[PDB]
């Protein structure tokens, strides 16, 4: 769910998740996808795409189990959808972490998300 997602992002990036990615670019946080503004944004673009492949569970409300092992997010082996959901979340946290080098504060609070160019299909 959103809780696990935010926690993973905090763990991987060490940044307030909502603060840094709640409204970042055209794909991070609220809203759907849009033309990515940068690598960090693409991470979220990929993440939202990952969510579409899910069936059987609610990505935003459904809680799933995962642990912190050797500073690595390890998804619990619960049901298939929750499992894939968890992996989707793990992947975006990791991706956001990997692209902190280009993270740009200027994209942090994009209140113009509705104006973003339409995203191509996943």
From Swiss-Prot:
One of its GO terms (cellular component) is extracellular region. It holds the Pfam family Phospholip_A2_1. SUPFAM superfamilies: Phospholipase A2, PLA2 (SSF48619). Its main location: secreted. PROSITE patterns: PA2_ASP (PS00119), PA2_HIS (PS00118). The record marks 15, 19, 113, 118 as: Cationic membrane-docking site (MDoS). It comes from the Eukaryota. Lacks hemorrhagic, anticoagulant and coagulant activities. Belongs to the phospholipase A2 family. Group II subfamily. K49 sub-subfamily. This is Basic phospholipase A2 homolog myotoxin II.
């Amino acid at each position: 769910s959103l809780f696990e997602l935010g926690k993973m992002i905090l763990q991987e990036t060490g940044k307030n998740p909502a603060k840094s990615y709640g409204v970042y670019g055209c794909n991070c946080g609220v809203g759907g996808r849009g033309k990515p503004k940068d690598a960090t944004d693409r991470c979220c673009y990929v993440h939202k795409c990952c969510y579409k492949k899910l069936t059987g569970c609610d990505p935003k409300k459904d809680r799933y189990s995962y642990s912190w092992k050797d500073k690595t997010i390890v998804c619990g082996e619960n049901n298939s959808c929750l499992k894939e959901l968890c992996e989707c979340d793990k992947a975006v946290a990791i991706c956001l972490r990997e692209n902190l080098d280009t993270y740009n504060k200027k994209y942090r609070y994009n209140y113009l998300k509705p104006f973003c160019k339409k995203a191509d299909p996943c």
